[PDB]
Each structure stands twice: as structure tokens, then as C-alpha cells.
Amino acid sequence: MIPKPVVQVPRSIKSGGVTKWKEGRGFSLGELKEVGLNAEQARLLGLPVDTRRDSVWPQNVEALRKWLIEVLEGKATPPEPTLPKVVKVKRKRGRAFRGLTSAGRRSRGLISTRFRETHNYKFKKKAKERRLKKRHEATKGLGNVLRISRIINES
Amino acid sequence: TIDPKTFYANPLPGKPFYVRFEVPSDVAEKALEILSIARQTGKIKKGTNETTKAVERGLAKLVLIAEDVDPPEVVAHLPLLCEEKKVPYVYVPSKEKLGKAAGINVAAAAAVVIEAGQAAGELEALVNKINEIRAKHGLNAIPVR
Amino acid sequence: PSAYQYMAMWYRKVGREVHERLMRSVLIKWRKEPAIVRVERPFRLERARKLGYKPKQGVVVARVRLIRGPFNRRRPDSGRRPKRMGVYGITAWKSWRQVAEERAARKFPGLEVLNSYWVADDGIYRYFEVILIDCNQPTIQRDPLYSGICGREVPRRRLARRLRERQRKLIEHLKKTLLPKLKG
RNA sequence: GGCUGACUGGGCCCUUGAACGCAAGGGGCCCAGGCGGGAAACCGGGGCCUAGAGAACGCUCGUGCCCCCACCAGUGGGGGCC
RNA sequence: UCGUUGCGGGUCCGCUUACCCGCCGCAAGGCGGGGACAGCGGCAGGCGGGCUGUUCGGCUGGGGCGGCACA
RNA sequence: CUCGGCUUAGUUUUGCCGGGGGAACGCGCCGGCCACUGGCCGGCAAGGCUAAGCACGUCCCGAGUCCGAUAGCGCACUAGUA
RNA sequence: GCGGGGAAAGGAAACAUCUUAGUACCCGCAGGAAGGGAAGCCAACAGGGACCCCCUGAGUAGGGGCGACCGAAAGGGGGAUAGCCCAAACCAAAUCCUCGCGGGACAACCGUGGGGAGAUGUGGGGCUUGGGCCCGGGCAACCGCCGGCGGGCGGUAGCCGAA
Ligand SMILES: [Mg+2]
Ligand SMILES: [Mg+2]
Ligand SMILES: [Mg+2]
Ligand SMILES: [Mg+2]
Ligand SMILES: [Mg+2]
Ligand SMILES: [Mg+2]
Ligand SMILES: [Mg+2]
Ligand SMILES: [Mg+2]
Ligand SMILES: [Mg+2]
Ligand SMILES: [Mg+2]
Ligand SMILES: [Mg+2]
Ligand SMILES: [Mg+2]
Ligand SMILES: [Mg+2]
Ligand SMILES: [Mg+2]
Ligand SMILES: [Mg+2]
Ligand SMILES: [Mg+2]
Ligand SMILES: [Mg+2]
Ligand SMILES: [Mg+2]
Ligand SMILES: [Mg+2]
Ligand SMILES: [Mg+2]
Ligand SMILES: [Mg+2]
Ligand SMILES: [Mg+2]
């Protein structure tokens, strides 16, 4: 069984000191250096590698050492390498007309802010929510109805 | 360091703004021939990037700049660099002829002589003539290297 | 420092005044030519090279002249609430650079726009240079940058076989070079 | 004749609003602080009594060794409670 | 008013290449006049039913005028 | 940075367009909910691409506490027909 | 699906800011999906680690004639998983396209000759675990091009199938 990296959930000020663990994106470069591989070797072996992470967790190191020992002793089959196996690039037609050049990206706001925070994204998201009648868009005026009802029932 | 607005403050008629002094045809042909003898015997570089690198590094002895560069800002910085580094330079009419003298199949906007093998004396005489022309045009002299 | 770094000085503070003196004469002849004109070389070579220009067959540089100001907002001729009746100051969410890119794409049908850059302004006009590529040119198809616009495919058998062979050799090497250190 | 109680911080009650929901406003009875008149009792929280009366948002002023402004401190500025 | 707006000479005078206007010319360019004014874009003030959106309360011996019996 | 405008939860603080002004360079530059200063922390804009995992229904297959010729699609039929 | 232009009716028990709604509709442009995507990020001194989509955070913060009403993000749980290139530093034509002939799985490519691009820079190199530059050691080097030969499976007609 290929191990999965364990990382700390970030301890927010709201939490007040309660900390928990989660599945990380990949093993750190320090953790991999602890066992004697770089990012290329680890990805060839099929491990998930997160070159961005700075932390080094001993549980991650122990799991890596154990699984690598099974792999080198032949009692385990590594998965396929964690590298791109396909290269599909489509011909681009009308990039200027669809606003995919640099000027179009700047006008759409992707240079300055995130895609989720751009205005076209907000428009599409609210349109989809209103069409499907999703979480908050199933009722219009839900907040005001809640406010008045809370006032009446908690007076 | 040389301020371009004062260096190019008085452009000559019928020439691009980066041409400081008029170079006669016999001097231009002479400088082309020295570039030819340098290519066959000593060492030269051709191309704006290589010539600028040579002038910055200090390995330049003589610089040749074409007067027919269509966007003049491609080579406008070279005379300012040559004046800052105290390297003599001369203008030639045709970038095509400059490239032919440099030995390539394409035009060259600028070229530089790193070492003049069999053209040291001719290079000195050419430098003296360009120095006299700069004297007539008011710019200071640039001694040979 | 490359020659392009010195070329950039004419659009900096040190070279602006001389470049502006040059532009005051160049713009007179630019103002008479057609609105879109293919040019042999870009006016800003370093900027073009940063944006992806190369002097290859099938690469087109087009100078585009257009009128500046806000877009031609129309006064509504039917009933509106007062917020929707304004004219002055209302602009489009497109920029003139994207407008110039679209116009050059219209002039050169079948070519793809790669990028564009501002060149100069006068009282009425703004000038851009648009880089376009012919995706049907063999000289363009194999370019590592232009393949992102013109398409590119790799058979999965090639990548899968090479990755599998690399993984097998890596396990074989690590069996010798890492297992004793791991176990000890 | 002497004064400023047309007072500071609070509470309860009556009326507006009958029995019976319900603003603002107005009146009464008090507790504490500190006063004025008076020998004292006692009275004084405007006019002998019943009329002269104005929500939200915003602004302004008074007040507090007052609270907050986004990793921490400071400066300017902003907001908050009464 | 900001920019277009440049070049000289002592806020003012001059100049033309900008720009504008007309003529010739397929075009290239030439001629004449004006001229850094005008025109043009942005901003700001004034006039502005030319055009757009609206509001024109209630009680009431029917509505309206009146009155406020509207606090 | 400043002015006008559209937009945004973005509020002295969202993104963008137009007019005007307009940097630096890794000993630098950017961000940490008003601005500046100091500390600390996090990064390297203004170039290009990228599979998988997600939308849809002309079409193909399956199912149905659906309707059953005034119902069900306007059309069970020489219906988008006369 | 992407970019742009862009209302009113109605609601607010009138109505203008507002909402309706960046909707209806219009113009332009793609794909079998599109767009997004690889930190000038988020956090808060503890740490996450490209992107999209789903559940939640949450009708919370916040916006607003602070009215009607509008309305996130970080974080957590999942689906899925993937990382790279252009320019520049340094070298300076070592390069690419086309065609003729010979060879070469009908290919790539190799030899040769003509033409075109290319010093205004083709190509090499480089991509945060920054690089260039100098020195030393080692291959498990690394990175690309073609899809020929063989095999398997599935689809586009069908065949058999008890009493
Ligand atoms: Mg809602
Ligand atoms: Mg309306
Ligand atoms: Mg009452
Ligand atoms: Mg009652
Ligand atoms: Mg009263
Ligand atoms: Mg914070
Ligand atoms: Mg004027
Ligand atoms: Mg005006
Ligand atoms: Mg009217
Ligand atoms: Mg009224
Ligand atoms: Mg009435
Ligand atoms: Mg009346
Ligand atoms: Mg029947
Ligand atoms: Mg029927
Ligand atoms: Mg409706
Ligand atoms: Mg209404
Ligand atoms: Mg109405
Ligand atoms: Mg996709
Ligand atoms: Mg895509
Ligand atoms: Mg909305
Ligand atoms: Mg190159
Ligand atoms: Mg049968």
C-alpha cells in the first residue's frame, strides 16, 4: 500500500489551539531527502511529491522508509510514475475574439485577482445556482425571512 | 552615463538621428575593408547583441554602425556606449555590405573588430581620420585602442 | 546586459525625449498609411521578443492604428430609468489592445493572434503592433512556443513506455544503492 | 429677603392607549450624589392643574485614565457604547 | 481646464512640420490659406420639457372649491 | 497616483475601461482588510501551455407508483402537414 | 462554452438610489466539452501547498433609500491528480523550411545538391529544489522524432441456447 502524506491543518486564530491532521498534497523534499530520493526519483517510483512544502514529518518519513523497503525488496509493486503520460494540446481558434490573449486576460481580471474572484466567474456561479435552485438560491429573501422570524420567535 | 538628449541634440539632415558625423564614402569603404582583413586574419564580431557585448566587455577596438537600420532604436544605443567606453566607431551606408564584409549571408546592422591581425596600421590611420572628422563636427577625439 | 536592455531605454525616462522627437516625425507618415499595415520588423524589438516574436516564415507583425477615447456609447432612444440614460464617461470592458488584436485577426483570416503591444499615441490615435502566426506553416508548427497555439499531440505509448522503462531502471539501481542504507 | 431643583445617576407607577394589544410625549412617588430657602418641619427634577408634542438612517456636540480597526507596535485617521 | 502642443527670439512677437481648410493629382506628391489657434478626446460649470422616468395625499351627505372635523 | 464611469460583498479597502501623470531592479520589487514608519512573515507581477476529475442533449440505449387519442410533444395518422 | 454590447415589465404595497440582472435579447468566437490551472498565493509565528467541479463554511462576514433585498472568501470533506515551456544571462549560424537525386519500417531520419528564412539572432542553454558562469566526479544519463511489425480487447451484421 502506497503511503499517503500526513500534514497539519493550519491552526487558525478562530480555532483557539485545536489542531488536526489531514491528507497532504505530497511528500516534502526534506522528507524525501531523509530517505535518499529527489523529486524525479520519487515521481518515477509513483510517490506524490510536493516540492512547495517546507515541513518534514517523522511519521511521513517512517512510512516512506517502510514502503520503499518493501519496494526495493520486491514485496510491493510501485504504481505508475506521477508524471504526465499524455500531451494533448488543441489548436486555438479565435483567441483574441474569446479574450484569451494577454489583453483579454487583463480585462477579465485574471492578472490581478483569482479566477474565483473575477466578476465573470461570479456571474456564471450565481446564474448556475439560480438555474438549479441550489443551496441559498432556492429561496429569495431567505436572510430577511430568517431575521424577521428570529425576532418574532426570540422576543 | 552620456545623456542621449544632449548627445543626439543636433541630428544631421538626411540621416537617422543616431548618426553623429558624416563619414565619406572612401572612409566607409576603408573601414569595410579593415573589417574584411580582420575577419580573414584577426577577430571580429557581427550583430548588434554581440557588438554591444564586446563594447561592454572592453574587447572592442573599432565599431562599425549601419546607417540604414529601419527601426533606428535597434542600434541607437551603440554610439552612446562607444563614447562611454572610449572606443572609436565609424558609420557605413549599407547593412547588407556590412554583413558581406562580416562574412555572413545576411545584413548586419553593427560589427566590431576584436583584434586586427593584418590591419593594425590601416586601423590606426582610419581611426585618425575618423578622429579628424569628429574634430570638425565638434565632438572630442577618441584615441585608438 | 544584452542589446535589448539598451533598446528598452528609449521607452524609459532616459531616452524618452529623443524617442518622442523621433515619434513626432514618424507619426506624420504613420497617420497617412492604412489603418492596418503589415510591417517587416517590429518597432519595439525587445518587447516583441519578450512577447514571442521570432523572424520565422509565417510570423506576421501588423501595425494597427485606431481612435482613442471611450467607446461610442449610444444614447437610448426608448424609455429608461435615469441610471441607464448616461453617455459621457461610460466605456467598454474591452481595451483598445484587444480591439486592435481582433481587427488584425479580421484582416489576416486564418492566422492566430499571439500577442500585441502599445507603440505610440497622438492626440487622436493609438498604435499597436500585433503578432500573428500561421498555424499551417511547417516552420511554425514545430516551434515549442507556437505549438501551444497550433496544437500538439504525443502518442501515449511513447510516454508510457519511456516512463515505465525509467521506473524499472530506477528500481534496479535503488536496489543496489539505497536498500542497505534504508535497512541499516 | 435669600437663591437656580428649568440639577447629576437610577427605579417604580398613572395617562396618552377604559375593560383589552400598542410609539413618542406628559404627570406622580421615590433611592443615591451634591445643593438652595428655612429655626425647624418641609419643599424644590420649571411655570397652581388639565395643551404648546417627533421614529429609523445620516450628521453634530457632550462624556469615559472607556472599547475596536484584520501578523505585532507606533503615529494620523475611522468606527463603537451612553 | 488637462492633452494633442513643436521651434526660435524678448507674459509677448515670429516660424512652420504638427494640425485644420480648399484646389490639382489614380496614387506618389505639388499649390494656396490658417496655424500651435482651431478642431478633437477627458474633466468642470452654465443654459437646457429638445428628449427619458416619475409624482401630483386623505377626509368628504357623490367628486370638485372650500375647511382640517389629519397631531 | 489622480479624475470620470461600469461592476463587485469589497466597505476611507473588488476588478476593469477611458483621460492625465508615471517607477525600481534582486543592495530590487510586491502582499499581509484606511495611510505611513519599524519589526516579522509570505512571495517574485506586468509572456505561453497543460490530461483527469464537472456542462449539454440533435442523437443511441435502458427504466418508469408518468399520459392513454379533448390526455400525452402542436403532430400515435400522406404534421410543422393542409 | 468563451469575449463584448445590454433593457424593461414586475418588487420595493407610490417612486428615483436599488432590485429585477450582467438577466432577456443582440454582435463576435471555439470544443467535444469549453473556460481555469502550477503562488509577486493563503495564513499567522502553527502551518498549508496548481486548477476545476461537488458537500459545507453560509445567508456568516460584508453591501444596501442599512429598506426591499443582495451576498463572499479562507478553512474542512470528496471527484481527480501533472507538470512544464518562451525570453534573458552565457556561446554566435553549430539552426530551421522546401525541393531534386541515393539510402532508409511507404515514416522519422541519413548523404548530397539547389532554393527560402536567419546577426533586427535560427539553434544550444534555462524555468524556485532560480539560473548563467568556473572546477571535480558518475551514467541508474537526460531530452526528443516516427507509429512500421506482432498480439489482445471492444464497437459497427449475427449464431447457439432446457422442458
Ligand atoms: Mg441570494
Ligand atoms: Mg421601473
Ligand atoms: Mg395615541
Ligand atoms: Mg385597551
Ligand atoms: Mg400632549
Ligand atoms: Mg489576515
Ligand atoms: Mg486650442
Ligand atoms: Mg472640449
Ligand atoms: Mg416630460
Ligand atoms: Mg404625495
Ligand atoms: Mg378623496
Ligand atoms: Mg377641500
Ligand atoms: Mg375514446
Ligand atoms: Mg392531441
Ligand atoms: Mg416575474
Ligand atoms: Mg413599486
Ligand atoms: Mg406603477
Ligand atoms: Mg477541458
Ligand atoms: Mg482548454
Ligand atoms: Mg448579483
Ligand atoms: Mg535563439
Ligand atoms: Mg435460436
Automatic annotation (TrEMBL), chain A:
Keywords: Metal-binding, Ribonucleoprotein, Ribosomal protein. The gene is rpl13e. Belongs to the eukaryotic ribosomal protein eL13 family. Pfam families: Ribosomal_L13e (PF01294). It comes from the Archaea. The keyword Ribonucleoprotein applies. The keyword Repeat does not apply. This is Large ribosomal subunit protein eL13. Mg(2+) binds at E137. One of its GO terms (molecular function) is structural constituent of ribosome. InterPro entries: Ribosomal_eL13 (IPR001380), Ribosomal_eL13_CS (IPR018256), Ribosomal_uL23/eL15/eS24_sf (IPR012678). It comes from Pyrobaculum calidifontis (strain DSM 21063 / JCM 11548 / VA1). GO terms for biological process: translation. HAMAP family: Ribosomal_eL13 (MF_00499). GO terms for cellular component: ribonucleoprotein complex; ribosome. SUPFAM superfamilies: Ribosomal proteins S24e, L23 and L15e.
UniProtKB/TrEMBL annotation, chain C:
The keyword Kinase does not apply. GO terms for biological process: cytoplasmic translation. This is 50S ribosomal protein L15e. Keywords: Ribonucleoprotein, Ribosomal protein. SUPFAM superfamilies: Ribosomal proteins S24e, L23 and L15e. PROSITE patterns: RIBOSOMAL_L15E. GO terms for molecular function: RNA binding; structural constituent of ribosome. SMART domains: Ribosomal_L15e. Transmembrane segments: none annotated. Disulfide bonds join C135-C150. PANTHER family: LARGE RIBOSOMAL SUBUNIT PROTEIN EL15, RIBOSOMAL PROTEIN L15. GO terms for cellular component: cytosolic large ribosomal subunit. It comes from the Archaea. The keyword 4Fe-4S does not apply. Belongs to the eukaryotic ribosomal protein eL15 family.
